[PDB]
Point group: C3
Chain length 129, copies 3
């Protein structure tokens, strides 16, 4: 037996530095667990208030910019977080978007970052059960 839902929706992408100066991780595996733990805590706290849980897929990365602006040679250690508003769990896309933005700001604070990006992209989600 099987079920499939298709619909138009939004995905998000967030990019954050990982302040090695403060957290002292030794590998991309370790920094992935660091950010995963922080996200898990803040997402749970928000869900308990609003009944909106924002799950995130987290990927290891480095971000390259001008060394004159503080970038290490070959790039700064970063993590990329992405997720989609699944109609199985989301009834109001505007409130979901507001929740993502709030979580992005909290992550910026917890990771002690000067700057952070949060993007929304239109997507067609097929969800299989």
């Amino acid at each position: 037996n099987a079920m499939a839902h298709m619909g138009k929706t939004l995905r998000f992408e967030i990019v954050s530095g990982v302040n090695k100066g403060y957290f002292h991780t030794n590998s991309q595996s370790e920094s992935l667990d660091l950010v995963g733990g922080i996200w898990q805590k803040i997402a749970k706290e928000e869900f308990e208030k609003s009944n909106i849980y924002v799950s995130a897929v987290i990927k290891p990365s480095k971000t390259v910019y001008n060394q004159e602006w503080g970038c290490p040679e070959n790039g700064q250690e970063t993590v990329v977080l992405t997720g989609v508003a699944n109609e199985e769990f989301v009834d109001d896309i505007e409130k979901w978007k507001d929740t993502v933005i709030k979580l992005a700001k909290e992550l910026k604070n917890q990771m002690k970052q000067s700057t952070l990006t949060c993007e929304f992209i239109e997507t067609e989600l097929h969800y299989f059960k």
Copy 2:
């Protein structure tokens, strides 16, 4: 002209495959995708290539998520007009592959997204 890209997220089912690292689980999914993409190409003459990335997916521990996230793989690809003449048939093929990956990886659930994109291909 516009085309489509796809993105799939899958678990790696340590209970069934018993991988010991993110490197090993990346190669596992790579090999499975290679087999199922070839099998579909033999039927339809459409080959769907995939870029695969290591990841962890974070959700509520009450729903079965490990502490700090579940080991996952992200697969993405694009409909390249060099190889694709019919976008509808390509889309149908991706959906078939997404279902087959869900089956082969023994996953309860699976996401497959389509996004509009403008592809520049340099050869």
Copy 3:
């Protein structure tokens, strides 16, 4: 308040550079991007930063793909209105850098995609 993001996928040419791990190949591509982006900024006043991710790309072994996939790097970035005034010129700059990366990495083929996105920038 829409802008564009880009995605590039490149091989890492073990035949030429002889890297021994995904960590080493990530630093290789990062260093090359850093140099070419700086050079272009000095000419055009457009700096294209990139997020770089480790990956493998899976295609038919009959076409040269290793078993379980080819080692690749994925580069993404977004046109931030804080720094960019003209989206057409930014896109032209990305395309030039994508071609230069193809040349420096000695790749036969390369993809560069553009996707519409809504950027929130927090400072």
